[PDB]
Design an enzyme around this catalytic site. Sequence first.
Site, PDB file in Angstrom:
ATOM      1  N   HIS A 137      -7.668  -5.451  -0.495  1.00  0.00           N
ATOM      2  CA  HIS A 137      -6.553  -4.774   0.144  1.00  0.00           C
ATOM      3  C   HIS A 137      -6.172  -5.433   1.470  1.00  0.00           C
ATOM      4  CE1 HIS A 137      -4.191  -1.028  -0.143  1.00  0.00           C
ATOM      5  NE2 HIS A 137      -4.142  -1.101   1.177  1.00  0.00           N
ATOM      6  N   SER A 174       0.803  -1.218   0.000  1.00  0.00           N
ATOM      7  CA  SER A 174       0.000   0.000   0.000  1.00  0.00           C
ATOM      8  C   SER A 174       0.838   1.270   0.000  1.00  0.00           C
ATOM      9  CB  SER A 174      -0.938  -0.027   1.192  1.00  0.00           C
ATOM     10  OG  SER A 174      -2.117   0.665   0.847  1.00  0.00           O
ATOM     11  N   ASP A 189     -10.102  -4.117  -4.460  1.00  0.00           N
ATOM     12  CA  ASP A 189      -9.368  -3.046  -3.803  1.00  0.00           C
ATOM     13  C   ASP A 189      -9.747  -1.707  -4.411  1.00  0.00           C
ATOM     14  OD1 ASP A 189      -7.460  -1.285  -2.700  1.00  0.00           O
ATOM     15  OD2 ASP A 189      -5.864  -2.787  -2.835  1.00  0.00           O
TER      16      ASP A 189
HETATM   17  C1  LIG Z   1      -7.757  -0.040   8.715  1.00  0.00           C
HETATM   18  C2  LIG Z   1      -7.198  -0.931   7.619  1.00  0.00           C
HETATM   19  C3  LIG Z   1      -6.563  -0.135   6.477  1.00  0.00           C
HETATM   20  C4  LIG Z   1      -5.133   0.262   6.837  1.00  0.00           C
HETATM   21  C5  LIG Z   1      -4.462   1.075   5.740  1.00  0.00           C
HETATM   22  C6  LIG Z   1      -3.611   0.186   4.857  1.00  0.00           C
HETATM   23  O1  LIG Z   1      -3.842  -1.010   4.788  1.00  0.00           O
HETATM   24  O2  LIG Z   1      -2.501   0.743   4.084  1.00  0.00           O
HETATM   25  C7  LIG Z   1      -2.722   1.795   3.232  1.00  0.00           C
HETATM   26  C8  LIG Z   1      -1.660   2.605   2.871  1.00  0.00           C
HETATM   27  C9  LIG Z   1      -1.860   3.657   1.989  1.00  0.00           C
HETATM   28  C10 LIG Z   1      -3.122   3.902   1.483  1.00  0.00           C
HETATM   29  N1  LIG Z   1      -3.282   4.970   0.616  1.00  0.00           N
HETATM   30  O3  LIG Z   1      -2.300   5.385   0.020  1.00  0.00           O
HETATM   31  O4  LIG Z   1      -4.543   5.549   0.456  1.00  0.00           O
HETATM   32  C11 LIG Z   1      -4.195   3.097   1.817  1.00  0.00           C
HETATM   33  C12 LIG Z   1      -3.981   2.036   2.684  1.00  0.00           C
END
Ligand SMILES: CCCCCC(=O)Oc1ccc([N+](=O)[O-])cc1
Lengths: 309, 309, 309, 308
Positions: free
Chosen positions: A281, A159, A251
């Site tokens: 995701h 991510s 995702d």
């Molecule tokens: C609460 C569970 C989701 C945690 C966030 C995750 O799993 O990592 C991420 C990193 C970056 C982005 N982004 O760039 O929008 C989204 C998600």
Amino acid sequence: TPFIRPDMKAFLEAIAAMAGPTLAEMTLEEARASYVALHGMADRPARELAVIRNLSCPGPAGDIPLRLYDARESREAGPVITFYHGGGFVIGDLDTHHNLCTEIAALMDLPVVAVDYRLAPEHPFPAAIEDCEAATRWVASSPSELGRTASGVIPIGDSAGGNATIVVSQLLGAKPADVPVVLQVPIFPLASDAVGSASLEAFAEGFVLTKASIEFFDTAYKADRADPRGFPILGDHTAAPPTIVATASLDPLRDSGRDYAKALVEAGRDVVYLEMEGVTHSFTNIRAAVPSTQGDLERIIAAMKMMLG
Amino acid sequence: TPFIRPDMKAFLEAIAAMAGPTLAEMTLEEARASYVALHGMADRPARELAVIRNLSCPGPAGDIPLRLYDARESREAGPVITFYHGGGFVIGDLDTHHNLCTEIAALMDLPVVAVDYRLAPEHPFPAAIEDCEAATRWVASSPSELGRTASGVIPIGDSAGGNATIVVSQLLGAKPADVPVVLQVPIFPLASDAVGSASLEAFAEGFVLTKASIEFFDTAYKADRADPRGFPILGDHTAAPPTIVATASLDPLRDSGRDYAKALVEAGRDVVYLEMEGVTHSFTNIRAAVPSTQGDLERIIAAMKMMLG
Amino acid sequence: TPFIRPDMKAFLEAIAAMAGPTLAEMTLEEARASYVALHGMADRPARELAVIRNLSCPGPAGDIPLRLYDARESREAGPVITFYHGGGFVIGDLDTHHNLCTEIAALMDLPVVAVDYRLAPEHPFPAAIEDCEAATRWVASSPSELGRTASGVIPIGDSAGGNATIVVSQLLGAKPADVPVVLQVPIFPLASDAVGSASLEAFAEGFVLTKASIEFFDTAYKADRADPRGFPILGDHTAAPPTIVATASLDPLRDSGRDYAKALVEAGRDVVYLEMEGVTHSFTNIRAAVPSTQGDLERIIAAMKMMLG
Amino acid sequence: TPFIRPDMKAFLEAIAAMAGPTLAEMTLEEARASYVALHGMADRPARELAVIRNLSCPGPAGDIPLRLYDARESRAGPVITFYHGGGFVIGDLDTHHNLCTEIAALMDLPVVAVDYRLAPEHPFPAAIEDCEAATRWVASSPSELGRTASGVIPIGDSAGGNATIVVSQLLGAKPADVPVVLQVPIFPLASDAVGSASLEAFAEGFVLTKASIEFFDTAYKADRADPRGFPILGDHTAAPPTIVATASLDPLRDSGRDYAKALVEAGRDVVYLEMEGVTHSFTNIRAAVPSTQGDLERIIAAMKMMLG
Ligand SMILES: CCCCCC(=O)Oc1ccc([N+](=O)[O-])cc1
Ligand SMILES: CCCCCC(=O)Oc1ccc([N+](=O)[O-])cc1
Ligand SMILES: CCCCCC(=O)Oc1ccc([N+](=O)[O-])cc1
Ligand SMILES: CCCCCC(=O)Oc1ccc([N+](=O)[O-])cc1
Ligand SMILES: CCCCCC(=O)O
Ligand SMILES: O=[O-]
């Protein structure tokens, strides 16, 4: 309508039934703590390894904490995996992704160095990138404290860490470290701006990562929309290293990963595109709650071995 | 100006010095013979195998000649590779690609069935596709005459054979054979119409495959430009099997292979995209005259083993 | 283990790697096309010349097509070379030996007229001889269509063309043309019947020209073993013109050329015998693939200038 | 009825009119003197050369006298090693001097002629021993030679053509410092002439006679089973490039045909030249029979091509 694995659906149902609050509703400490509890609940247990050791390296705003993982106390020269955790650049740390790191180290028989990079809102963009870049350069210099020699580096991360993976490959591409980036593995990365994408709307709610959370992360991190270090789809791809792009079919950021893999093909770079079907995701860190996601991780591993030769 | 390997450049210089006729200036049989001589004098010798035998299967125009290659005289059920040679659907046969077939069989340790499909101009579009499809379905039925049981089929082919690979995959996807396509490997395929692409103009002359040859093949074969059996970029990619697209950076058809890989990513399909740097079209069959191309083939083989699990 | 030059051996290994059908297993058209492709791939490019013109002359079965080569657009009276290509009297044409003809013309600074004589099996023995003799007499008459006056003629040819060279010289010896044969150059000719000879068994396979091919040509052409127009060792050598006999040490027909040269010495005639060491039949037309054969042709050229002289 | 050039025929008839004695009817020294007189009246004059120098070299029975001929005082390349004719009984450095100057002028190579031991005083194999030793000496590029040999070219007429072949064979079996790059046996005795059709057809009246051949044979006493005496019996499989020149009116013609045939049979490169309408000794009658100069110039042209 969209295909979802039965084990993945039941985990989504359990999340919905638990009915937690949003990232906005929580305090920073609570949101960070919730991420720790999710992965602690949902991921398979850490592997037992010969070496799980804290380190640190000089950084541009002070020392950067690191964690080295290795199935071997002593090993020949070879590539070193440099790992950057997910969490919007706002949550996550060395512990949220600890078990995943031990799994990569055990399955690859390569050392993994995870980076405890500075987080937003305390440290907005580009703080996270500065630290990930500096730690990767440090590893690439084979410093005495690392205890093993690096013939190359392998940036990898989920991510926001997948975003950092690509930005780091591009920064080292423009200005080489002591050894080359021999492979990069962005896992469900943020590469292009998700705003306006069909996957963002179709998976805005109910698929672990939400549109609400994405907006929360973006407000805290405040990445420049025109900066390739914030959105590396904008970088120069013509010398991109060998790449494995792994995405999830459910995702909101899926189309962002599709865009990046397509841009690599358009530039004639070698790339493995893997879209895990029926999962969300964060699948790399929910391998006990959704047991089939262990198989998704092992596909990435197999691709990494092939792409390393 | 574009990067060319030294052993690749020496091959191009030998071709340039010869200063021979174009395919259109030869008789049809002289064109076919010149392709026998090209591969015959540039490719590595055949591997020794336990089984190399001619057979045939029923087709809609009559019997289709086949050649089975196998490193083992006896083997359990497993995937069977179904191979379609290059040559613009006008030239090539079982012998022009024979040595490459033995190499695929040896290195994969899987049986390979090559198809001696009907050629244009005698048999226009879609005769080659009819025979490639019929042979692949026949193999997939585990016929007694094959002596091998098929759990899945692996269409593979170079150039026009890469076109046939994708079309066969699309046709079996829409109307399944007895077992599925488990992997397809179009090698420098014609997938989209090359007319108008940047690579066609950049590599129109001097890179083994010429624009004039492409036009010579096109006039003989007469594929319908709106027909996905002629130009499988037009087909439904939403259920495409796992895919390895391999291209050459100096190929006028390079952008056609880039387009197909991008289309698979756009549709969320798993794809390995390999673009071999500094070599031309036909690199799978010039492995003696240009020794570095053996390594290119071995990368495809490694990708195939990875994608088969 | 007879001596083979390294560049010659590399060529024989590529031929052995190519493998494929024998001449008798191909169609006639395929057989002729494979000869075109062999020489096209193996020989040096044509020389640029002032004059390369297609002509024809009358013959006993109809017009005989011819090709004139000259380094000069205008020249005074002098000897004219009359060339008959190899190919067993079954294959070959004006194009298979075209580059060699330009080389002879460029290096000798003399006009060359190549003869497109009738081929077997369509036209059995002695059709090829009829046409070679008629075309040589025509050239010797200094026709206006030729544009050059002949003070003498120089029959020359490779293999079947070297057989024709000797036969034509004997026919013109018995019944003179308008000017004499001033020199003949049979190059690896068939002079005596090769069956039973030590070189035929020693070099039956693996030396470009095979015993199977010789037998294929013999069955198509059907020369009478008692007929000196088929086997000119049988003819009258007592007034043979000055002669250069060139052979190859690895040729199944080698001993046939040895026999003819010995017969000339026995009859007290002037002869240069050159046996090229470490190369095969067809060395005059493989000068790019086996670069040392260019030097072999240059020795023949030097011998010709010497004998003219 | 055999063809004879007009100038060649006039020479044979004037010889016939003189009606001189045979070799057997002369004393040994009368025999040698008449050979000096023949070439003296019949050959073209010597060429002017920068270098005509006597030398000597070690031999297995004492020093072998030699004569160096060179158009140039200063020149590395092949060196011609010449052995004169005369049955191994007559001739010397003077009988073939003019021919040697002509070969040196026309080739622009140095020529070293060998004053080898003669029969009956020194029978077979003395001549061969000296011809071999002198050629090896030349092939070593000794300081006293004054030029460097990259290779040697044995050449000789008649008995000297016999020595040419024997030397090439001996040096082929045991190499000198540089190879024989070309040999030029001129009307050689290679195979025993007795029995040959040419010996009978030209037994009398063609300069060289059957009686003379028998006279030389009885003096030299070559062993008929020895390849050093009859080199047709030698190993031809590695013969050097060869120019065999013969004459159509020569009792020894068929022996030269035999040898050239044996080379072809062995797959060796050979130029066979049979001069039409002239006799044995044509290399040395170039004034009395002016067309024989053209015959020599053809041998020269073949030598240049074969070198080349
Ligand atoms: C609460 C569970 C989701 C945690 C966030 C995750 O799993 O990592 C991420 C990193 C970056 C982005 N982004 O760039 O929008 C989204 C998600
Ligand atoms: C002499 C090289 C021609 C064959 C090259 C080759 O390997 O086969 C193909 C080439 C071009 C196309 N095409 O234009 O689709 C198809 C097949
Ligand atoms: C496939 C290459 C070899 C066949 C062609 C060739 O080598 O040219 C010849 C011409 C005449 C004869 N012949 O009369 O036996 C043999 C060979
Ligand atoms: C009186 C004229 C004849 C002189 C001898 C001659 O013409 O030169 C010869 C050298 C050698 C042999 N031989 O070896 O038989 C024959 C002849
Ligand atoms: C889209 C074409 C359907 C099947 C046609 C064929 O069998 O060649
Ligand atoms: O074949 O251009």
